[PDB]
Amino acid sequence: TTALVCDNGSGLVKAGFAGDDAPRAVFPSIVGRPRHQGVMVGMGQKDSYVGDEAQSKRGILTLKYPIEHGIITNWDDMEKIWHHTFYNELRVAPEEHPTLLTEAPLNPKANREKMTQIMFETFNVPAMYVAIQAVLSLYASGRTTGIVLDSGDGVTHNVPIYEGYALPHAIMRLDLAGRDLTDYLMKILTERGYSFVTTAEREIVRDIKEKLCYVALDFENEMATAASSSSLEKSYELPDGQVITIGNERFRCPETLFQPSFIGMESAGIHETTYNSIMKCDIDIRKDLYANNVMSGGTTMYPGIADRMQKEITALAPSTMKIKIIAPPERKYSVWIGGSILASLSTFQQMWITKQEYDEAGPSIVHRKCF
Amino acid sequence: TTALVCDNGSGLVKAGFAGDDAPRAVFPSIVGRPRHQGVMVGMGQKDSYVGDEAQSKRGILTLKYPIEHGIITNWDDMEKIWHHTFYNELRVAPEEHPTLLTEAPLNPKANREKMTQIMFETFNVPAMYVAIQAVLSLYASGRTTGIVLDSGDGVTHNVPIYEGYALPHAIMRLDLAGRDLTDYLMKILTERGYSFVTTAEREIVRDIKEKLCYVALDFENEMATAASSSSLEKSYELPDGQVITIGNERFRCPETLFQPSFIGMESAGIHETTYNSIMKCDIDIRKDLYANNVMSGGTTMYPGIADRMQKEITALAPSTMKIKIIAPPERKYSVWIGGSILASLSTFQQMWITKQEYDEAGPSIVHRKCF
Amino acid sequence: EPKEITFLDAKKSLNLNIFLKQFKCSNEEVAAMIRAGDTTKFDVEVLKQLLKLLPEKHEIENLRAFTEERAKLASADHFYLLLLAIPCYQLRIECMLLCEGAAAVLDMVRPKAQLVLAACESLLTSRQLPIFCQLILRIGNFLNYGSHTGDADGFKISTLLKLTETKSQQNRVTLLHHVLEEAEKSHPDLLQLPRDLEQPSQAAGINLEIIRSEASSNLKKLLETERKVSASVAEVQEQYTERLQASISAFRALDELFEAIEQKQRELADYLCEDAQQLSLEDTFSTMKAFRDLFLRALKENKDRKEQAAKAERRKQQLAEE
Amino acid sequence: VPSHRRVNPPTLRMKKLNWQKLPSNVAREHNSMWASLSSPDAEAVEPDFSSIERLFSFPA
Ligand SMILES: Nc1ncnc2c1ncn2[C@@H]1O[C@H](COP(=O)(O)OP(=O)(O)OP(=O)(O)O)[C@@H](O)[C@H]1O
Ligand SMILES: Nc1ncnc2c1ncn2[C@@H]1O[C@H](COP(=O)(O)OP(=O)(O)O)[C@@H](O)[C@H]1O
Ligand SMILES: [Mg+2]
Ligand SMILES: [Mg+2]
């Protein structure tokens, strides 16, 4: 039987079958309830809408984004999202397909235990495995040992992996991602002169972040030519006719990943958390950490992030002139694609958690099979 | 030379001489035009009534507000408002008096260009100034720091300001004020059978909103009291001699200020907007802002707004630090009082915008001079 | 007369003019109630603005070296000369600011510290809370039979948070819902369980170390100010010593109350059988506030469930009648 | 010996439950509320085990 892979994202939950090149379902991490009061019949309107149906009818719906910074806080809405993800998005029953799952790094243990007990008691899966998004992100590149930068919509993390097994001591957290970049992009486009108070304006700024924004090889040099660059200044058309012009901000929104002092916090960047996370490991693994550095998430689609990661790791680490930072073109879904690669293999059949293991061991099996 | 303070608000224009306590010319900003035909030849049938003459003769006039949501939409009407308030009310030449003016926060720049060019080219002045309404409202209270919430006729905006430094990012604006409460009062008065559809009747509904409405301290208890006993029902006499009696509409009409879902807006109440304004500030100066909440604008004339506002802020915020509401009885004219304080200073002579500065820098020096 | 001979710059004179114009009176009266010791027109913010607009060393030297007519000066400079005419004016303004701040901090902290003391005293002595733990552990020891987690004779208070984590087959009824639904039928005294624990309700809602450091800093400042007034003249003594002694006595009673909170915190740590090195004070109050909110929502959702069951039963009897 | 330990064995498989087990010598102190569980004089509420068995059992 074919397996199911879902990436439970902070901003985009993806779902599909194992072995597929692309996820079949990509829907935002939203649960909508009807905004106004009114009952009638109306040929049986649903009490709750999730996903693409929630996106489509979103004017008469109040939405909820229940994942805050990678970490699950509201659990019933995750249960409703997982019920949509199985029963209508893929149109399956979860009691015969083994289901691979994703966790944010530095997840609390009670969250993993609650996640496992809701998979085994409510949905009653016959097999489930929780993987860190970075481990699947390394599996999409096709290796088993190395450090991986993963920045999604919730939170940025740098995770070292040894033979498929992560090291939770040297995982480091940077408290920004594509939602925080989106908020900063509304902030500096408002400083440019615009205003985004509505829903559709926020979606247009999200698509501006999708299309136009990039990372330069040098921030200071591209500042130095910013007034004089004829190719830097882009723009975008809203469908009702509003025009949004963006200039140097195209490489100020993702450079918040490289320098978080742009927005006003003193946390270390995506290259500095990577370097500090490499030094917190054992010494022997660190060359394999530099050799298999994979960036992942939709927050790494900015063109020219590869050579800037190269130059920043070149600046911090004098041993890393020639090693290349691997950037797959499909690293939007490298968590999902690596989950497809991991679940589709015939070597993964032992690593699944059975129902009887949860029954005899409790929820704490997630501490001991998923490591 | 006596300066002139002229708050050209959305609801009522308040103009007078500087250095005084009360504005001499308080009159609503409406332009009345006769929708019917004239048969009575002679006796000065002038085609556009402006001010109190439009108010007194309102039963045959279409009334247009030149200000809509704090934006000067109609410009010929607003010029007629300025011509009436200079020549008919104050009866002073503009060329021998400085004229202080007020403005809403987050205004368009070309709007400021247009009021500057009308105040320098048509009505020539020796000097003029444009100031934020919340800053003058704070200066009437006599303190240098604090948060000013101002609820006019179209705009309810929150401005926190610390030592005169107005924080731009922590200013925000909610389009829910007295005209929207008036329209909701028209909508809910038809439940009792009273119809008001004409613009002449908007003055009557605004008058009963001024006279009879009040903020409930608790909405559910006042609902139970109004449903249980008819003790809170109050009568009003219309100008045609008919007497109406209203019940729960005395408090259902200002409750839109705390619950915008009545008129169908997704945004929260003014307490939550004040709270989100406070969290946008730095954490050190929040203690000064919580004890210095200053109201201004006539929409805060409902005699239950202070205790309910203190209850809502003390419930929503953490209770570590002091919650104090500054609600002076003369806060309706606190914009004019603060303008009269600011205009009558010896240090203010060098912040005036002269005619020579206008000739040097166009109608654009108000951007670089004022905040 | 544009030569106002003001020794200040434009900005500080502008701020002091805005400050002076709020009092709606002459600056002679302002220097009078600075000297006479009045607290009616001076709250914390006005005294903070006055201390933020103090005269500087060169400004005081230029005012003292001034020898011409006093009427030629500005209102700011005449106010500073009236301020300098007051002996130890900065000490008197500091006595104003510290007595008003001490009174405000005392009226804020003292009912909340009494609420914390009543909270921990009612947590140490509760009536229906043993019977509620009896019913909870009876159902819990029924449920986890034959496992390694079974056959326990107690739990921490954090297990009261974990009651909400339980959900039924319908994913709508919690364990707390079922316990309160059975307690509504069998033993209604557990429904009077929040009545004893209403003084544990709302928690502290604060951090006790922040207000304790602020109270200790205020008491230290009051002791320093009392020592400085003791070095000053007898007019300042008769103006301020009784109020400073009352403030020091009230803050000493507050420190005795903080020591009682520490002793009852150690008693509450031994009461729930947890070591005192971990946070057993704010975690327990936030725990009890959270659990009492869970109790109130469970009560009203069980009432709403019974009300909608009765309404559905009335609708079923209606459609059977018709 | 205690009343809460007297649990009948149910016929059907029952849904499990998560909290953290703590030792019994710690929990039977004089300052603990479960000494009233250790004393038989307290109000003994009998749970309807048939209702939990018909409701909360595992479906086959
Ligand atoms: N082409 C793109 N360029 C830039 N940003 C993009 C692009 N496509 C999506 N994004 C943004 O990046 C984020 C999507 O990344 P991703 O799918 O990895 O997040 P997630 O899985 O929801 O988050 P997390 O892994 O923290 O749970 C969103 O904030 C989205 O707006
Ligand atoms: N006594 C009152 N009670 C309740 N509301 C009032 C009262 N007086 C005025 N208002 C409302 O407040 C507004 C006062 O206008 P104001 O704030 O002075 O200028 P603007 O709102 O045009 O900027 C009016 O639109 C009116 O609806
Ligand atoms: Mg994801
Ligand atoms: Mg106004």
Distances (CA, A) of A39 to A33, A45, C3, C304: 13, 9, 76, 18
Q: What share of chain D is helix, strand, coil (3-state, %, to 5)?
A: 25, 5, 70
Residue C121 burial by Cβ neighbours in a 10 Å radius (0-12, 13-18, 19+)? middle
Q: Is A10 in the pocket of ligand 1 (CB under 6 A)?
A: yes
Backbone angle region of C171, left / alpha / beta, with phi > 0 → left and psi within -120 to 50 → alpha: left
- CA-nearest of B325, B141, B144 to C47 is B144
Going by DSSP bridges, is the β-strand pair A12-17/A25-28 parallel, antiparallel, or unpaired? antiparallel
CB contacts of B169 in chain A (<8 Å) are 187
Q: Which atom of ligand 1 is nearest to the CA of A67?
A: 27
SS (H, E, C) chain C: CCCCCCCCCHHHHHHHHHHHHHHCCCHHHHHHHHHHCCCCCCCHHHHHHHHCCCCCHHHHHHHHCCCCCHHHCCHHHHHHHHHHHCCCHHHHHHHHHHHHHHHHHHHHHHHHHHHHHHHHHHHHCCCCHHHHHHHHHHHHHHHCCCCCCCCCCCCCHHHHCCCCCCCCCCCCCCHHHHHHHHHHHCCHHHHHHHHHCCCCCCCCCCCHHHHHHHHHHHHHHHHHHHHHHHCCCHHHHHHHHHHHHHHHHHHHHHHHHHHHHHHHHHHHHHHCCCCCCCCCCHHHHHHHHHHHHHHHHHHHHHHHHHHHHHHHHHHHHHHHHC
* Residue A148 near residue A293, CB atoms below 8 Å: yes
Q: How far is the CA of C283 from the centre of ligand 1 (A)?
A: 36
C171 interfacial to chain A (CB closer than 8 Å): yes
Q: How far is the CA of A87 from the centre of ligand 1 (A)?
A: 24
**Token pair of C243, please?**
């109020």
D18 interfacial to chain A (CB closer than 8 Å): yes
Length of chain C: 322
**Token pair of A48, please?**
């709750």
* Amino acid, res. A244: I
* Residue A335 near residue A133, CB atoms below 8 Å: yes
* Residue C128 near residue C292, CB atoms below 8 Å: no
* Phi and psi, residue B242, nearest 5°: -70, 150
**Token pair of B112, please?**
């400021």
Residue in B106, B169, B266 closest to A35 by CB = B266
Residue A316 burial by Cβ neighbours in a 10 Å radius (0-12, 13-18, 19+)? middle
User: Residue written as tokens 């990436």?
Assistant: A7
Q: Tell me how far apart the terminal alpha carbons of chain D are, to the nearest angstrom.
A: 36
Q: Is A179 in the pocket of ligand 1 (CB under 6 A)?
A: yes
Please report which helix (H) or strand (E) contains residue A231, including its range.
none
Beta-carbon contacts of A127 under 8 Å, excluding residues fewer than 6 positions away, are A98, A99, A352, A353, A354
Angle at the Cα of B12 from the Cα atoms of B10 and B18, rounded to 5 degrees = 110
**Token pair of A76, please?**
């019933």
* Residue B285 near residue B272, CB atoms below 8 Å: no
* Residue A290 near residue A221, CB atoms below 8 Å: no
How far apart, in whole angstroms, are the C-alpha atoms of residue B86 and residue B64?
20
- Structural Rg of chain A based on CA atoms: 21
Backbone angle region of A106, left / alpha / beta, with phi > 0 → left and psi within -120 to 50 → alpha: left
Burial D17-46 (b: 16+ CB within 10 A, else e): bbbeeeeeeebeeeebbbbbbbeeeeeebe
- CA-nearest of B204, B212, B302 to B256 is B302
Q: Work out the angle between the directed axes of helices B334-343 and B133-141 (0-180°, nearest 10).
A: 80
**How was it solved?**
cryo-EM
Residue C316 burial by Cβ neighbours in a 10 Å radius (0-12, 13-18, 19+)? exposed
The residue whose CA is least distant from atom 1 of ligand 2 is B210
Residue in A114, A122, A362 closest to C171 by CB = A122
* Test the A interface: residue of C143, C144, C161, C167 with most A CBs within 10 Å: C167
* Amino acid, res. B232: L
Q: Which atom of ligand 2 is nearest to the CA of B14?
A: 18
- CA-nearest of B25, B68, B77 to B48 is B77
Beta-carbon contacts of C288 under 8 Å, excluding residues fewer than 6 positions away, are C119, C123, C157, C197, C200, C201, C203
Q: Is A155 in the pocket of ligand 1 (CB under 6 A)?
A: yes
**Token pair of B291, please?**
């004890």
| Count of alpha carbons within 13 angstroms of residue B267, beta-carbon side | 18
Task: Provide the resolution (angstroms).
Answer: 3.8
**Alpha-carbon distance A110 to nearest alpha carbon in chain D (angstroms):** 10
User: Residue written as tokens 């002169």?
Assistant: A193
How far apart, in whole angstroms, are the C-alpha atoms of residue B84 and residue B50?
7
How far apart, in whole angstroms, are the C-alpha atoms of residue B255 and residue B257?
5
- CA-nearest of D55, B110, B200, B122 to C177 is D55
Chain A residues with CB within 8 Å of chain C CB = 76, 79, 114, 122, 362
Q: Which residue of C has its CA nearest to B348?
A: C14
Task: Identify residues after which chain B is interrupted (C–N over 2.5 A).
Answer: none
Sign of the four-CA dihedral D21, D24, D29, D32: positive
* Test the A interface: residue of C159, C170, C171, C301 with most A CBs within 10 Å: C171
Beta-carbon contacts of B359 under 8 Å, excluding residues fewer than 6 positions away, are none
Please report which helix (H) or strand (E) contains residue A91, including its range.
none
D30 interfacial to chain C (CB closer than 8 Å): no
Do chains C and A touch, with touching meaning 3 or more CB–CB pairs less than 8 Å apart?
yes
Chain A residues with CB within 8 Å of chain B CB = 35-36, 62, 187, 195
* Test the A interface: residue of D16, D19, D58 with most A CBs within 10 Å: D16
Length of chain B: 371
How far apart, in whole angstroms, are the C-alpha atoms of residue A297 and residue A332?
5
How far apart, in whole angstroms, are the C-alpha atoms of residue C175 and residue C159?
12
Length of chain D: 60
Domains in chain A, ordered, with CATH?
1-27+70-134+334-370 (3.30.420.40), 28-69 (2.30.36.70), 135-181+271-333 (3.30.420.40), 182-270 (3.90.640.10)
How far apart, in whole angstroms, are the C-alpha atoms of residue C200 and residue A163?
51
How far apart, in whole angstroms, are the C-alpha atoms of residue B169 and residue A150?
31
Q: Is B66 in the pocket of ligand 2 (CB under 6 A)?
A: no
CB contacts of D16 in chain C (<8 Å) are 143-144, 147
Q: Do A363 and D18 count as a contact with CB atoms less than 8 A apart?
A: yes
How far apart, in whole angstroms, are the C-alpha atoms of residue B54 and residue B32?
5
Q: How far is the CA of C262 from the centre of ligand 4 (A)?
A: 53
Q: Do D19 and C162 count as a contact with CB atoms less than 8 A apart?
A: yes
Beta-carbon contacts of A39 under 8 Å, excluding residues fewer than 6 positions away, are none
How far apart, in whole angstroms, are the C-alpha atoms of residue B117 and residue B78?
13
Distances (CA, A) of B153 to B11, B64, B70, B83, C245: 5, 14, 8, 22, 52
Q: Do B266 and A187 count as a contact with CB atoms less than 8 A apart?
A: no
* Phi and psi, residue A144, nearest 5°: -115, -5
* Test the A interface: residue of C165, C169, C175 with most A CBs within 10 Å: C165
Going by DSSP bridges, is the β-strand pair B234-237/B243-246 parallel, antiparallel, or unpaired? antiparallel
* Amino acid, res. B65: Y
Q: Strands across the sheet with B49-50, in order?
A: B49-50, B31-34, B61-64
How many of the other CB atoms lie within 10 Å of CB of B74? 15
SS3 A8: coil
Q: Which residue of D has its CA nearest to C143?
A: D16
Q: Which atom of ligand 2 is nearest to the CA of B9?
A: 23
Q: Is A23 in the pocket of ligand 1 (CB under 6 A)?
A: no
How far apart, in whole angstroms, are the C-alpha atoms of residue B139 and residue C18?
7
Q: Which residue of A has its CA nearest to C165?
A: A114
Residue in B106, B169, B264 closest to A36 by CB = B264
Strand partners, A16: A5
* Residue A332 near residue A184, CB atoms below 8 Å: no
Do chains A and D touch, with touching meaning 3 or more CB–CB pairs less than 8 Å apart?
yes
CB contacts of D45 in chain C (<8 Å) are 134-135, 138, 182-183, 186-187
Structure letter (DSSP) for residue B170: T
The residue whose CA is least distant from atom 3 of ligand 2 is B210
* Residue C5 near residue C73, CB atoms below 8 Å: yes
* Amino acid, res. A193: G
SS3 A146: strand
Q: Which ligand is nearest to the CA of A10?
A: 1
Q: What is the DSSP string of B20-50?
A: -SS-SEEEE--EEEE-S---S--TT--S-EE
Give the chains touching D; criterion: ≥3 Cβ pairs < 8 Å: A, C
How far apart, in whole angstroms, are the C-alpha atoms of residue B308 and residue B258?
10
- CA-nearest of A61, A64, A13, A72 to A33 is A61
Please report which helix (H) or strand (E) contains residue B354, including its range.
strand B353-354
* Residue A352 near residue A98, CB atoms below 8 Å: yes
B244-250: long-range contacts at Cβ-Cβ below 8 A with a sequence spacing of 24 or more? B244/B192, B244/B194, B245/B192, B246/B189, B246/B192, B246/B208, B246/B212, B247/B192, B248/B222, B248/B223, B249/B185, B249/B188, B249/B189, B249/B192, B249/B213, B250/B212, B250/B213, B250/B214
CB contacts of C148 in chain A (<8 Å) are 362
